[PDB]
Structures are given as structure tokens and as C-alpha cells.
CSV table of C-alpha atoms and ligand atoms in Angstrom, one decimal:
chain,number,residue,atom,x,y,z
A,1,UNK,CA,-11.8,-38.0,-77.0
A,2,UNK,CA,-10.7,-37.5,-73.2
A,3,UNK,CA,-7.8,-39.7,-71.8
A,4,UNK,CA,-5.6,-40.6,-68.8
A,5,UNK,CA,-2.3,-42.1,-68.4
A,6,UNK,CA,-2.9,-44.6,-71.8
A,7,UNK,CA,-6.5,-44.6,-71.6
A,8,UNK,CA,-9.4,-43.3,-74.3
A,9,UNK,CA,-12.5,-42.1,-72.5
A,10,UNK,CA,-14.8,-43.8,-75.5
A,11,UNK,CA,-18.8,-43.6,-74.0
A,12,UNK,CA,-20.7,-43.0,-71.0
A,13,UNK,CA,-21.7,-45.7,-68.5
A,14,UNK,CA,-23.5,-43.5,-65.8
A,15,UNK,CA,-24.2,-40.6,-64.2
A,16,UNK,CA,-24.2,-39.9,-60.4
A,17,UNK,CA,-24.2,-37.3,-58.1
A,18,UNK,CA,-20.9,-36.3,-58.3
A,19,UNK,CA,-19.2,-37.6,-61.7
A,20,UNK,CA,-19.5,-40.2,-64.1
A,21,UNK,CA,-18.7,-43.1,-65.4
A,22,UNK,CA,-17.2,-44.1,-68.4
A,23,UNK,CA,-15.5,-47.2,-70.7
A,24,UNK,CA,-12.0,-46.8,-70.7
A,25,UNK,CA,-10.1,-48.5,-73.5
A,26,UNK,CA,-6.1,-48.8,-73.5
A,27,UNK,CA,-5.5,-48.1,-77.5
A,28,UNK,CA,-2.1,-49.8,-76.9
A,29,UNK,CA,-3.9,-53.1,-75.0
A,30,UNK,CA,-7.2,-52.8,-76.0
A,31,UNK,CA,-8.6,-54.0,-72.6
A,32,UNK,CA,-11.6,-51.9,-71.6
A,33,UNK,CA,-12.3,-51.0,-67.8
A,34,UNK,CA,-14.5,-48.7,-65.9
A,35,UNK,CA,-13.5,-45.7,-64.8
A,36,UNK,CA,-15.6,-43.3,-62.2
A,37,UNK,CA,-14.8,-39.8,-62.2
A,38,UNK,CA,-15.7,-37.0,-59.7
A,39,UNK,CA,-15.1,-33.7,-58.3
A,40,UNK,CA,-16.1,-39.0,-48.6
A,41,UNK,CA,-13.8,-40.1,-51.5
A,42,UNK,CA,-10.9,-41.4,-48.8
A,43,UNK,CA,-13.1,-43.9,-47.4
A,44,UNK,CA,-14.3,-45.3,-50.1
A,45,UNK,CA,-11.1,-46.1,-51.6
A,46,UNK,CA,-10.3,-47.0,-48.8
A,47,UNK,CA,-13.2,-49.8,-48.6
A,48,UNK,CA,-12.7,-50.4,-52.6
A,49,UNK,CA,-9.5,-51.9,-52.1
A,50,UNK,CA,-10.6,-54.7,-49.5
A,51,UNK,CA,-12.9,-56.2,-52.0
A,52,UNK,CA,-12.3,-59.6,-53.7
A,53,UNK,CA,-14.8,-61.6,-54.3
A,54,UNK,CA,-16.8,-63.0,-57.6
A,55,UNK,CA,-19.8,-61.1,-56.9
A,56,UNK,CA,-18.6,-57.6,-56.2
A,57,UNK,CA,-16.9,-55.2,-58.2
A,58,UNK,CA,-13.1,-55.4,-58.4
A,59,UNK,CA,-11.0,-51.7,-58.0
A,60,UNK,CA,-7.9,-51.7,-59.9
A,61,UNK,CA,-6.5,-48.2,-58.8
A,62,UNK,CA,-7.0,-44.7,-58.9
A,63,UNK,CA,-4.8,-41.4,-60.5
A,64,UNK,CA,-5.5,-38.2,-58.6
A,65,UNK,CA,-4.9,-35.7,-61.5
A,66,UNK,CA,-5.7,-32.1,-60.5
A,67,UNK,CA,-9.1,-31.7,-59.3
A,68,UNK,CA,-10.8,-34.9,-61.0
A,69,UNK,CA,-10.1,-38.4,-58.9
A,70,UNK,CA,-10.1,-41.6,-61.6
A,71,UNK,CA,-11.3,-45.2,-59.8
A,72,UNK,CA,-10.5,-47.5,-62.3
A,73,UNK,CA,-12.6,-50.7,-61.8
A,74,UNK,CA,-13.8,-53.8,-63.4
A,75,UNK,CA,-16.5,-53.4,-65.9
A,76,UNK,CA,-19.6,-55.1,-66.1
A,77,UNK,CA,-20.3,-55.1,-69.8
A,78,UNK,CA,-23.6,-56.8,-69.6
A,79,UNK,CA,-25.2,-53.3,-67.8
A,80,UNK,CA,-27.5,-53.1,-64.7
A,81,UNK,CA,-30.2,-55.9,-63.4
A,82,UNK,CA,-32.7,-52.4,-63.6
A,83,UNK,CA,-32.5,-53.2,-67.0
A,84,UNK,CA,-33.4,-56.8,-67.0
A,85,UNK,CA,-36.5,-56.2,-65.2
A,86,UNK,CA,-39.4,-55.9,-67.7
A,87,UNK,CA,-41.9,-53.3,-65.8
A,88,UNK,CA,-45.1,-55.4,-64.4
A,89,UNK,CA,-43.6,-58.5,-65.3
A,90,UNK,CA,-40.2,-59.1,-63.6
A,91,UNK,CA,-38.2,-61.7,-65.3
A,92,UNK,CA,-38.3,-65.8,-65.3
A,93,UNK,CA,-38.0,-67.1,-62.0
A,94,UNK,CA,-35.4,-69.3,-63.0
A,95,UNK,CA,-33.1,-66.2,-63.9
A,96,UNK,CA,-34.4,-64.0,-60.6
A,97,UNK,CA,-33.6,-67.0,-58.4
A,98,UNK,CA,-30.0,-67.1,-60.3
A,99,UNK,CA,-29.3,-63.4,-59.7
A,100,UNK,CA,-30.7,-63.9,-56.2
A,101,UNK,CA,-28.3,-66.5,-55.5
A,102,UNK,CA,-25.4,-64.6,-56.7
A,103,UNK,CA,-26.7,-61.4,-54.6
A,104,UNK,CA,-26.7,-63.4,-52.2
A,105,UNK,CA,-22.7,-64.9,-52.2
A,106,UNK,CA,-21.9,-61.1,-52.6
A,107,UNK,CA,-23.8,-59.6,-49.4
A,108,UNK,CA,-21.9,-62.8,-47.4
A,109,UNK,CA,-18.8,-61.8,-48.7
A,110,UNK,CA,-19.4,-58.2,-47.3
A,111,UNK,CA,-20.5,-58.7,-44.4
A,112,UNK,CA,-18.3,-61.1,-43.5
A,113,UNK,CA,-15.2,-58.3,-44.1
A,114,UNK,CA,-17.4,-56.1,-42.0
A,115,UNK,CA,-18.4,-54.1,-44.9
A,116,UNK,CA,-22.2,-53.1,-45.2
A,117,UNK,CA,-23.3,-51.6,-48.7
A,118,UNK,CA,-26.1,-49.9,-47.5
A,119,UNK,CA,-27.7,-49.1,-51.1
A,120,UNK,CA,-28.4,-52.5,-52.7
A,121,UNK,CA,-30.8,-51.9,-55.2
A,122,UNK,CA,-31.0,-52.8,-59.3
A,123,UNK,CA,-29.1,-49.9,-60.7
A,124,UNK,CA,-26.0,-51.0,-58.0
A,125,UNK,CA,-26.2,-54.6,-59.8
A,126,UNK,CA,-24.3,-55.0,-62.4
A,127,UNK,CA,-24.0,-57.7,-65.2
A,128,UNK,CA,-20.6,-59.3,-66.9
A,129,UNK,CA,-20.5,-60.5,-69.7
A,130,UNK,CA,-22.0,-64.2,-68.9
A,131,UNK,CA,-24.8,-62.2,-66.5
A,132,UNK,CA,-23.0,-63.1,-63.6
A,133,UNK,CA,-23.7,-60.2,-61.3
A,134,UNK,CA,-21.5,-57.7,-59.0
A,135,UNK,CA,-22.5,-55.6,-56.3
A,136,UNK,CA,-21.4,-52.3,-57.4
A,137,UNK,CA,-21.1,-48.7,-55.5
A,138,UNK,CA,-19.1,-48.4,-52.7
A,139,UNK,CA,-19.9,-44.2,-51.9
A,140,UNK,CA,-22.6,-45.1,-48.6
A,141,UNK,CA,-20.6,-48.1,-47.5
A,142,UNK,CA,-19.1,-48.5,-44.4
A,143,UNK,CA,-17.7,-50.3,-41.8
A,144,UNK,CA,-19.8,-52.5,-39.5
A,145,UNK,CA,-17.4,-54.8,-37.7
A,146,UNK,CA,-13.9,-54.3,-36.6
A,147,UNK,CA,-11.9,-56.0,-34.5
A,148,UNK,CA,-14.9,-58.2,-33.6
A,149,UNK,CA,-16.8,-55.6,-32.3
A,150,UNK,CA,-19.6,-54.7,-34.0
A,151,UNK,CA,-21.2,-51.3,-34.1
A,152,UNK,CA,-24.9,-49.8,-34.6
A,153,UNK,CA,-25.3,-47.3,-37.9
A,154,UNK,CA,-27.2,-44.0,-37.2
A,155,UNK,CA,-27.0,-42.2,-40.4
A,156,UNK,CA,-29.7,-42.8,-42.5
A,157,UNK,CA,-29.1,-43.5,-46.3
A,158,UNK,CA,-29.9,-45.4,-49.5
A,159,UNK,CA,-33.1,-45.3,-51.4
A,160,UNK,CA,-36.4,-44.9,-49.5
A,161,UNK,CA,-38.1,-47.8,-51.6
A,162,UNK,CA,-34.9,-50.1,-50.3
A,163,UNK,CA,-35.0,-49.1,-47.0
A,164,UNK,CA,-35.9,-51.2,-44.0
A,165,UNK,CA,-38.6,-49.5,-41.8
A,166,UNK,CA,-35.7,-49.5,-38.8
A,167,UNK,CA,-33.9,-47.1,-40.5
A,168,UNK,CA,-37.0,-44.4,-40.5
A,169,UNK,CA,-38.0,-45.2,-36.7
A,170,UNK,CA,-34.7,-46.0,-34.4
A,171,UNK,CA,-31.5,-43.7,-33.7
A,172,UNK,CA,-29.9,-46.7,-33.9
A,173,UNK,CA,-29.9,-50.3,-36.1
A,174,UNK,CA,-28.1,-52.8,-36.7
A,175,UNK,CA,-26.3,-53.2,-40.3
A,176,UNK,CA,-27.1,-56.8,-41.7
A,177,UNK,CA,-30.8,-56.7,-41.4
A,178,UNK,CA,-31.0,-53.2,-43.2
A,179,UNK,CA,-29.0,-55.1,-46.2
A,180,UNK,CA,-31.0,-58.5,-45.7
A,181,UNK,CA,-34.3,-56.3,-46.3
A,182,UNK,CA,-33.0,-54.2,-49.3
A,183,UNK,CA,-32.6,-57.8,-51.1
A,184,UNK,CA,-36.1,-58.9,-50.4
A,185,UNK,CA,-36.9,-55.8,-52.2
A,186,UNK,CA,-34.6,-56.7,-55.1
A,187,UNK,CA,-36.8,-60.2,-54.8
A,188,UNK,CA,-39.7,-58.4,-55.2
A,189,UNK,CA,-38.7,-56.3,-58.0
A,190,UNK,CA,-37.1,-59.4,-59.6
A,191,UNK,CA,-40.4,-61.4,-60.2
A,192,UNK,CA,-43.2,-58.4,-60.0
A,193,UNK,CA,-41.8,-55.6,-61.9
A,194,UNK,CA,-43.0,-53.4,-59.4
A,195,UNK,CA,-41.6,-52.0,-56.2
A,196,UNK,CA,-44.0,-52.8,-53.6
A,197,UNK,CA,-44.4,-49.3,-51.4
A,198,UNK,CA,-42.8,-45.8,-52.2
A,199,UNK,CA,-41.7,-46.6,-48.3
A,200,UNK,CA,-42.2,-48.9,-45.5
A,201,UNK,CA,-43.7,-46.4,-43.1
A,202,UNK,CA,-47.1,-45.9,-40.9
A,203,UNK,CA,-48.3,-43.7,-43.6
A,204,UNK,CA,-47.7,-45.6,-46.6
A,205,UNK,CA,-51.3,-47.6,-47.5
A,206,UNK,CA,-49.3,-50.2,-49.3
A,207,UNK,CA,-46.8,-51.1,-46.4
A,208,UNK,CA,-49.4,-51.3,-44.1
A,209,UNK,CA,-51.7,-53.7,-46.8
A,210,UNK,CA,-48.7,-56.0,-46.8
A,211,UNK,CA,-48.4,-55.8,-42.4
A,212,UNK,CA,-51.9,-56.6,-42.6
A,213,UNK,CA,-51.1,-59.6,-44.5
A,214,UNK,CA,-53.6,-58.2,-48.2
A,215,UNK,CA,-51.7,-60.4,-50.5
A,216,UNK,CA,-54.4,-61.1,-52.9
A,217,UNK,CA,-53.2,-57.2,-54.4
A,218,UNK,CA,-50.4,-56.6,-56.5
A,219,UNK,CA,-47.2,-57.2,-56.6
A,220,UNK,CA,-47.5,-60.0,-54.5
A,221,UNK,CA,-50.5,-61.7,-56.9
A,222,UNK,CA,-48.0,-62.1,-59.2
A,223,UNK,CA,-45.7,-64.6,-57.5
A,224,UNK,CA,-45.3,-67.8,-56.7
A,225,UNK,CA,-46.0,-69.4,-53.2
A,226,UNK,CA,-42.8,-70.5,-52.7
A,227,UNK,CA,-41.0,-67.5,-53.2
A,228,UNK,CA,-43.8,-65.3,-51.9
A,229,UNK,CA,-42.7,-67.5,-48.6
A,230,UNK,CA,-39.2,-66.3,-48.7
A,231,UNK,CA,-40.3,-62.6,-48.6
A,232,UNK,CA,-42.4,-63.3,-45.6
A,233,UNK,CA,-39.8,-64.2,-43.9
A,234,UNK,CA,-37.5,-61.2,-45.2
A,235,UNK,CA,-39.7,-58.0,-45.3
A,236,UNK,CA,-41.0,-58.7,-40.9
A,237,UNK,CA,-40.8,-55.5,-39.7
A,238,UNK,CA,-39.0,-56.5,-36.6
A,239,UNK,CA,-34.9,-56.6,-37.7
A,240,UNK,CA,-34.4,-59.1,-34.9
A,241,UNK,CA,-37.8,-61.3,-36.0
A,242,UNK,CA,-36.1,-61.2,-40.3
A,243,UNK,CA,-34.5,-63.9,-41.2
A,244,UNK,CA,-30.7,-64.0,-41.5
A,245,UNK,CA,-28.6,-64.7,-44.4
A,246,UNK,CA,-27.6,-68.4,-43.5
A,247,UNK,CA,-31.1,-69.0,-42.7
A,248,UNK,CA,-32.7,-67.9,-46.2
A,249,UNK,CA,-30.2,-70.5,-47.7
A,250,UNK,CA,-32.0,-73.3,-46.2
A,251,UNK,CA,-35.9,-71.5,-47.6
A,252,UNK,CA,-37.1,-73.9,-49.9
A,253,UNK,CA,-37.6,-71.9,-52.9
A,254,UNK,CA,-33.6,-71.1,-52.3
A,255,UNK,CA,-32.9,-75.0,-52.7
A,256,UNK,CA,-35.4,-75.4,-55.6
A,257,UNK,CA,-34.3,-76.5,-59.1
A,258,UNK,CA,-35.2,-74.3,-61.9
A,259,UNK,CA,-35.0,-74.3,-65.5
B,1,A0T,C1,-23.5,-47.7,-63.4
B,1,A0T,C2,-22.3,-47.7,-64.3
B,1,A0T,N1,-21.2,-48.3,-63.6
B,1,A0T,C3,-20.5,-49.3,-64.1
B,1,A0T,N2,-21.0,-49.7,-65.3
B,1,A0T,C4,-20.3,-50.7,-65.9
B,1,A0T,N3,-20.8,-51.1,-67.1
B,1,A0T,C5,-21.9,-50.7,-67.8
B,1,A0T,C6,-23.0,-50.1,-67.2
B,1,A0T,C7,-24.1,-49.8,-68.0
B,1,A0T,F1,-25.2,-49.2,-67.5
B,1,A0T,C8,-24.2,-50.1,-69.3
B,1,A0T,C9,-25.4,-49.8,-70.2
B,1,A0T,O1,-26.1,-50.8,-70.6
B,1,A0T,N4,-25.7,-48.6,-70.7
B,1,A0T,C10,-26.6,-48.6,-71.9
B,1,A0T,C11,-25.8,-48.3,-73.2
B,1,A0T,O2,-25.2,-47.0,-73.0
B,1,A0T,C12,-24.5,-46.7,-71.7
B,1,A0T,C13,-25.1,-47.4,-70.4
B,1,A0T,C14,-23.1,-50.8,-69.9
B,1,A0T,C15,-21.9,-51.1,-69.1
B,1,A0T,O3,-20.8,-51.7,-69.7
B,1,A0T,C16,-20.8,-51.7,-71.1
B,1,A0T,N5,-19.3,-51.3,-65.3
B,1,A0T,C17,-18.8,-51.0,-64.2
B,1,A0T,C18,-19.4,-49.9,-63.5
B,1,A0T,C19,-18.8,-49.5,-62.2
B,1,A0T,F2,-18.5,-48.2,-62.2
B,1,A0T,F3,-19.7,-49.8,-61.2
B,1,A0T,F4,-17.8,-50.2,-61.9
């Protein structure tokens, strides 16, 4: 039975590196939020706070109590897409093009604040309560564009299955494409149940059977044409060659009805 200001600390959500999450429920109001708890933290407020968009996780506010910082944010009661991903099997296309969509309207909405997120993966998407999904995690965003100008990352981060092979070869990249790439991952992952290298590097077999084009082997056996198009066009090893964001909205398996 922990608490802050009127809030019950009632069951664990997550653990991260540093903290926690858990549901917070006002026992005067009864409304139920998220609350992260820890202890970098500045900034990530800081970049919290510009968010507002359907597809990304809202922030309410944070109390600075002694050592322990509380973010109070929306909550996502439906859990992660990590969980909706049956392994080998994926999920329905119908519902992985849905959640790509969404995925999608969120990473637009990011970068067009100048945010990048820089760890888009399925324990970062989270569900409501009607599986709509949000774009969650904000601790290795950062600022891309500002004032118009935009500027090359050099710090290398996120997940090494996620990452785009840029990140591991050049002191310098260009955000979008690294974000653009992570998705096609999330595609992937979406309608194989299986990530498709441990890492997209020279030494990694299965990176260099999907350069060389081998997709009579798995995961890519398992889907679809039309999708396995779009991921062509997303996992090119050149960032300048993928494809961009207002380009994969006119793919055809993007415009596709599905049932
Ligand atoms: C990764 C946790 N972060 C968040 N998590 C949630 N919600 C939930 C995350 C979950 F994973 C689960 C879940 O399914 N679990 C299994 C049952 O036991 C606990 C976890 C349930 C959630 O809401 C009820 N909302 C907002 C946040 C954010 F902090 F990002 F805002």
C-alpha cells in the first residue's frame, strides 16, 4: 500500500532500468493512471510534455518527492503489442496492418515536433482499452529538428534487433530512417512471430540471407507478398535508398482493405 499526493500504488505495470511502473488509483476519484518511478530525467520531461497526439502516450505531471521522481501518465490498460504477438505465428494481418497504421500516425506525429524515439519496439507499444495503440517511453528520445535545422545523432542506442545497420557503421545518421527501420521490424515481428536477425551486421548469417535476397527461409516464408513488398522497401540497407514515411502510405498493402 504505497501512495502519493491522493494516489494508491495498487500493482506493478513494469520494470526498467531505473524504477518501475505502476497503476495508480485516486481512492477519492477512482480514476487510475500510470505512474513511473525512478531513482537524463530533465530532458525527458522535458520532451513528455510536448506530446499530444492519439497515438502516443499522454504525461499528466510529475511530484519530485525526496529522492524518487513520479511521471504520472496515461495508462494503457490493454498492456503491450509484445503480448499480442503469438511466437512463430504473429497475429491476423488484418490486426498487424491496424496497429501498423496507428504506429504509423504516431512516428508522423513525432517527427513532425522534431522528436525521434529512438527505441520503437513491442514492449514501447502499448494498448488502451479499445487496442488502440501509444508509442510509449520517452528515456532515449531526443531532439532531431529545431528551428528548422535538422541535426545528425551519433550516440548509439535502442535494441540491437531494432536497430538500423547505419547506426553500427556511421559516426553519424540521420534520425527518421533509424525510426522508419525499427517499424519494419515491428512489421516483421507483427506477422512472423519472429525477429528476423539478432542484428543487421556483416556478421550476422541471417542479415546477410535477407541482403542476398533468401526469402524462401523464415520469417519471411510466412508472409504475404504484399506485405513482404512493403518490408523490401523498409529494411534497404542504404538510409537514403528506404523508403520514407509519406511514401509507405501510398504501398499497396498500406491501402488494402482487411477484414
Ligand atoms: C510498460 C508499462 N508502462 C505502462 N504500462 C501501462 N499499462 C499496462 C502495461 C502492462 F504491461 C500491463 C500488463 O498486461 N501486465 C500483465 C498483468 O500484470 C502487470 C503487467 C497492463 C497495463 O495496464 C493495465 N500504461 C502506461 C504505461 C506507461 F508507463 F508507458 F505510460
Amino acid at each position: 500500500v504505497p501512495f502519493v499526493e491522493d494516489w494508491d500504488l495498487v500493482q506493478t505495470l513494469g520494470e526498467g532500468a531505473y524504477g518501475e511502473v505502476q497503476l495508480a488509483v485516486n481512492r477519492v476519484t477512482e480514476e487510475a493512471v500510470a505512474v513511473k518511478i525512478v531513482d537524463n530525467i530533465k530532458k525527458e520531461i522535458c520532451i513528455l510534455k510536448m506530446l499530444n497526439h492519439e497515438n502516443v502516450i499522454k504525461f499528466y505531471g510529475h511530484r519530485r518527492e525526496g529522492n524518487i521522481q513520479y511521471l504520472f501518465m496515461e495508462l494503457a490498460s490493454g498492456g503491450s503489442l509484445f503480448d499480442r504477438i503469438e511466437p512463430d505465428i504473429g497475429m491476423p494481418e488484418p490486426d498487424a496492418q491496424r496497429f501498423f497504421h496507428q504506429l504509423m500516425a504516431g512516428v508522423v506525429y513525432l517527427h513532425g515536433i522534431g522528436i525521434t524515439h529512438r527505441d520503437i519496439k513491442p514492449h514501447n507499444l502499448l494498448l488502451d482499452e479499445r487496442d488502440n495503440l501509444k508509442i510509449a517511453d520517452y528515456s532515449l528520445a531526443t531532439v532531431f529538428r529545431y528551428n528548422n535545422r535538422e541535426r545528425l545523432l551519433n550516440k548509439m542506442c535502442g535494441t540491437l534487433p531494432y536497430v538500423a545497420p547505419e547506426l553500427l557503421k556511421r559516426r553519424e545518421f540521420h534520425a527518421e530512417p533509424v525510426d522508419v527501420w525499427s517499424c519494419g521490424i515491428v512489421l516483421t515481428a507483427m506477422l512472423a512471430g519472429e525477429l528476423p536477425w539478432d542484428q543487421p551486421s556483416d556478421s550476422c548469417q541471417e542479415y546477410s540471407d535477407w541482403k542476398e535476397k533468401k526469402t524462401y527461409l523464415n520469417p519471411w516464408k510466412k508472409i504475404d507478398s504484399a506485405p513482404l513488398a512493403l518490408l523490401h522497401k523498409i529494411l534497404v540497407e542504404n538510409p537514403s535508398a528506404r523508403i520514407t514515411i509519406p511514401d509507405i502510405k501510398k504501398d499497396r498493402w498500406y491501402n488494402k482493405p482487411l477484414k
